[PDB]
Design a protein around this ligand. Sequence first.
Ligand SMILES: OC[C@H]1O[C@@H](O[C@H]2[C@H](O)[C@@H](O)[C@H](O)O[C@@H]2CO)[C@H](O)[C@@H](O)[C@@H]1O
Ligand SMILES: OC[C@H]1O[C@@H](O[C@H]2[C@H](O)[C@@H](O)[C@H](O)O[C@@H]2CO)[C@H](O)[C@@H](O)[C@@H]1O
Lengths: 809, 809
Amino acid sequence: EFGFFDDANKEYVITVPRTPYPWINYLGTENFFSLISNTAGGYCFYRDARLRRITRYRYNNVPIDMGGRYFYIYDNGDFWSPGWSPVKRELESYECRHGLGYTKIAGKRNGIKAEVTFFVPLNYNGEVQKLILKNEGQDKKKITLFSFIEFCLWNAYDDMTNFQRNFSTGEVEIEGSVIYHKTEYRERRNHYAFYSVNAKISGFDSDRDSFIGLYNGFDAPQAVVNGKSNNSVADGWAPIASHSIEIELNPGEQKEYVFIIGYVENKDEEKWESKGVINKKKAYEMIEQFNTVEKVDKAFEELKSYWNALLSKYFLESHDEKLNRMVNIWNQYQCMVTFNMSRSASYFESGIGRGMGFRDSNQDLLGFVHQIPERARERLLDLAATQLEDGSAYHQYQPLTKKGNNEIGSNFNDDPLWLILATAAYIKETGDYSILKEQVPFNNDPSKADTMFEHLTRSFYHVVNNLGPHGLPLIGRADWNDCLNLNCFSTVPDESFQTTTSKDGKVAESVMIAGMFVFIGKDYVKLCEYMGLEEEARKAQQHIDAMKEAILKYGYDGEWFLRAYDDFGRKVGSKENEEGKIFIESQGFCVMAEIGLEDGKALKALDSVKKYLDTPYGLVLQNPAFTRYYIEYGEISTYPPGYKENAGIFCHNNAWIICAETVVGRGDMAFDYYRKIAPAYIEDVSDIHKLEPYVYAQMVAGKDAKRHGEAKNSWLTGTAAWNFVAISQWILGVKPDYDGLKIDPCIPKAWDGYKVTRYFRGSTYEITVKNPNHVSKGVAKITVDGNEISGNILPVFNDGKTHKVEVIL
Amino acid sequence: EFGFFDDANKEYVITVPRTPYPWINYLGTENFFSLISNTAGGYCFYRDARLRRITRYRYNNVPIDMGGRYFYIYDNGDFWSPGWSPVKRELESYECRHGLGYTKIAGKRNGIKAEVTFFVPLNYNGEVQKLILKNEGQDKKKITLFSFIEFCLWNAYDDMTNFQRNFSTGEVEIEGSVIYHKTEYRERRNHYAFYSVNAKISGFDSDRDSFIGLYNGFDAPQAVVNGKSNNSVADGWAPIASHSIEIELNPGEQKEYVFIIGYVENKDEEKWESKGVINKKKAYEMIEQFNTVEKVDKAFEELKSYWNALLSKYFLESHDEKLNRMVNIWNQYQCMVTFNMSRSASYFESGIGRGMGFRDSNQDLLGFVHQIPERARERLLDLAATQLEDGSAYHQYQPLTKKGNNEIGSNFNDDPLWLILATAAYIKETGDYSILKEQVPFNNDPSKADTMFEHLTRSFYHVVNNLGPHGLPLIGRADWNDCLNLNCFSTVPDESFQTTTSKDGKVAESVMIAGMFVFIGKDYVKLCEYMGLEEEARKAQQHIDAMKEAILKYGYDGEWFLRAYDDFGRKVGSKENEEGKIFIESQGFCVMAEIGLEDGKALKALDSVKKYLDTPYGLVLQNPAFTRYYIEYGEISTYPPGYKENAGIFCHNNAWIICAETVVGRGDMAFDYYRKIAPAYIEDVSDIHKLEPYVYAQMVAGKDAKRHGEAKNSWLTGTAAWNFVAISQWILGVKPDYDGLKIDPCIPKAWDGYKVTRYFRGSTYEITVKNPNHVSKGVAKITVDGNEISGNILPVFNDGKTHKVEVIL
Ligand SMILES: OC[C@H]1O[C@@H](O[C@H]2[C@H](O)[C@@H](O)[C@H](O)O[C@@H]2CO)[C@H](O)[C@@H](O)[C@@H]1O
Ligand SMILES: OC[C@H]1O[C@@H](O[C@H]2[C@H](O)[C@@H](O)[C@H](O)O[C@@H]2CO)[C@H](O)[C@@H](O)[C@@H]1O
């Protein structure tokens, strides 16, 4: 391990700066966003990492994670950094606390302690850094403090490619203790950035080559080495911001400073104070907002209250402290962060993309719908507005413009069903059926607008109408697995596997889409019945039954469910195949659809999953891994064995196996699968996992990889939402439902019980589950407010009170 | 100064490594290309810096220029680099010789000297590095040598943006002393790279985090610090190549090693030696090709002979050694390099672009036509094949695919005339009129193909058919000045100034295009007369005369020539304007067209140019500089004053001013303009110039900038070609022409004379010019082989002999 969980403060405490990888945190809630590592590396942006990046950051750098908010303490020739980077001189003590929306970093050297709190306050377009300098020695000290950030030229791709122009465009202004970055403000941009401190400065620097030196690195800037600022004014090349303050500290005396990285937008008419001088009124207001430590503390407390209110809708009390900290703090926090950040910027996503997946946007809603219902409803309507008339969807949704990517296009045939699933989840959470009657346009065209229920109908009948030779849905470009491309057949290195199609797409089928169709058609039929359309519900049920028969006749291999048929009409995921005899997605979604429950097919498939796909670090996508390129399969075989979609552990689809295990009533298996990938349970092998031990990652190397157990692409994935749904609804049995809160746990037998406090439709339910006879599944009795009820659906109160619920299995 | 010229060896010798900016050189002639700095930084690629990059390089890095071919000498705990980078430990001696297609770097520390010669041999797909280690001390030594390169993932944009996939794709093999990089070779790619040394190694490394360490930089890799290789095999993340050799050196003993960075392409049926093992036959042949120092020396001598033959067609003997070294070595070398490299990769061009300008290829042809006439003919035909049917051209030409960029498009209305100018230059150089009768397609469509002369006709009549209200040519998106956008009117950031047009383009005219039309229509009329089309020649002359009258009536401001009219119909470049009262382009091209020679208008315009645009470092584009954004002008006013097109020194049009000065017979002024920007004449202010003192740069900061005199965007520009044409043809007076070689010098009066040896149409002319009366212009007598001739056109011999020519002014 490299740290520990602090549950009372809801923090992760990193105690050594050399983590196996830089472990990061996110700051900001609405528009200003910051990525900050445990050594204070990273960068910030305003609403768009691609088009409004404020500070410069280099991905895949040597050394890693160089560039950030760098403070230099200069003490009589010696100099060091509180985060131990970039200087990397040994510290008496180091600590990084990653909290909810904030990060604290403390470092000590030669009797001088520096503590910095970084956070983005609510309704504020800036990152606030509170710095405490304390003299813990026995002698009076004279030191110099240096701040440093490196600006980006607002357009990351242009900033890293277009030097022939942009080496001559960088412009700054320096006034008082504020350095303003105003590149291209003179022509078309109405926005600028600033770096300020709330104290009189001894000097400044705004030219990178003056502060650092051409042949020096971040670890030893020449101005810091010499102990004084050069007072350089930037002119092209690389604009930066640096203050220098000369401080005398008596023994036991401390001083406090507030540094602000701020973003300002001006109206085109109010752009100039005079000729060539930017208007600084908004920056003055922003800086005065946080010119004392007391105001910063008030904002910090308000952010704490905001996050506490966000996390308070689902509270678990069990005997397992790791489970408690996953359910109560970190899973919900990651779900909220994933809603705030989409898939834009991480230490693996470089921030140059244009949007996120349509299916990913729908799937995250299942995770965060219980925390932000109104924003979830707005997001659902926005996603539905981009749908095409035929019921298909744009593969990439852009939340910034609320539009679909026309360049990427459509023909990912699983995408429409996710909209129905997310809408059903929203309705079951809130009970708000009115969303079905909203007027939603098609293709963002107000002229052709219909009800939201009509959008769901088109989504259902897009699958109904695009059936293949066996009656299973046509896969198209791909399904949930974006690397299963059965219509590509690509031989040329530079073409995309997802948008290049050399086949008509009339043969290749997906049984994973078939399982999704059967699973989500129940919700569609229920919504048909709510709308008063009995014939429509009957016809939809007929189609669902036909799909179920098709899955039984052509989608089962004998001991597990098949994966697909290719353009040749050959089975994918069959025991007759040499490699890839069994995939994981079809098993999970077919068992979740209750197919094979009575004849033992589902149990056989789950036993096969355990036999062939199980590892100590999770379940691999398919077995055996592909050891060569398969032109008929697409991108999946292009990876080396055990990585990404070629038999890696995709923790996103492990949650479906967890749910399916709850379906057959095996709670021990479900919780054992849950524990293998939950961050709090692998904190003890953090060195093997190598990524953050407090958030889910997308991918863990499988048993065929030499790095078996190592993670990639952390912090930004649909794993958090689906795993929270699996643990909180399927295992713990607190399930939203159309008529109310359903209680149906499936837990390990040895558990004596637990309790969950759930806020649901305007009321609080304190549900205590007991297991006197140690079973896994089956409710014997439910009592509400002292009175026995019938069934497993709790009454809806909507009275703002607390109701005691007592459950005996 | 940071070095000196070595004329006998044709090298520039850099003597201090802390040079004001990394000074680079190019290696390779046909397909394999290398950029190498004076500290051995840079990278290689195969024909395409964008899609076939072999080694990784980080632009705009901190510290600058980190990453390259890094050799580490480990001596009993100490370690250092012969290029002084990346280790940056002080050396007893350092030297870098930049030659023609090769670079030598020598470094000495603690009695150990390391000398490395880098070059790409002819007809070889690899970079060869010959390393000599010498013990110059008095004691026997035991050392370890480490090599290091960092691989790229073949697609630089993908390599720097797509970590979510490509952190799991990196693959290598290690066999003997060769490390093979084969990422995606198991897949659609049929090419791989290798790093070899011709000796048994003590160890290797192929994983970056094992050789270097996650938190270490290039300056102190952990394997080098420990003095031992880790023998790591890469698996995803960052593949690298490193050998380690343990060497014992007696006093006075030296060892020799050959390192090769090689590129191999295999046939799809011969990709594998066995399952999972790449076929290494071509790599074995390539490595055996240079496994001894003698073979490397033979290849080095062959490269030297090739480069000597390339520069031998124009040889100057004057009293000025700086002029001699510019004309004989460095200008011609830069012209050939610019033909080989287009505008793809420099230390300012990041290698991500798709091609070069159509006008830029045409203009470079003028520079290199005397060195490679056959390749110039092929390039001319390739450029003409992309022309549209109406005579317009695609703005960006892509020499790799020999096609125009359809996304960028057309409507740059000066582009077609450059094709006529380049074709006329080729015909004047070679006398080969047959190129006019070649069948050339339109829009790369063989069905619609016509003669090359028909292409020139369409180019000529595009201007005739796109005249404006005053009879001057419509400017369209832009003319030669790509930042003068009079139809854009953009208020929104992140949209191209060159391809966004909010006006119909029926008002704005360009005086510069009018001057080009008059200047190049003479050549078009001559070519019309060659084909026997008398009526066509008469009609073309009528159009030229009409353009001349239009320029005289509407293009002259009273003291100088106007620049343009905008979409409002207002004068651009007029004394009535508050800023930008005079531009430089119109003066040069109108005087070159001989428009105001008799009435004193041309002399008046040149005097105005001297009065308003002249600086000690060159001539600025326009005066006064724009101090605010002008929406009606486009990108030109978006720069800060004195940079790029906003009153920077564009050395490209200084050559046109030099030619115009020769036209009015003022040789002192022309040579004074030539000297201000010629690299050999500013080597003494190298610290101010800051870029390479042996090649031209695109841009020097103007008198309105605080960095007045500083250069940007070196090594890749049309400045070299036009300046060589200005010095060698207009000042020295050796001008190719129809019917032969014309002698018409315009030189400073104080010169006594000079001599030029010129290879022209199969014969050599040794031309001695004498100035007994000390005039600037005017030929009194010409004698060939002892017999006085009439006129100033030399006879064509085509006999492979040398002919003595005496010219008396
Ligand atoms: O396959 C599951 C997951 O794939 C995501 O697409 C990735 C893919 O994982 C990767 O192999 C490929 O190289 O890049 C794409 C991104 O374009 C997809 O974004 C998810 O929606 C999907 O669940
Ligand atoms: O203007 C002369 C020169 O311009 C080149 O275009 C550059 C331009 O200099 C720069 O200001 C702008 O930002 O980028 C473009 C490149 O797209 C052009 O390439 C040359 O042909 C032209 O001679």
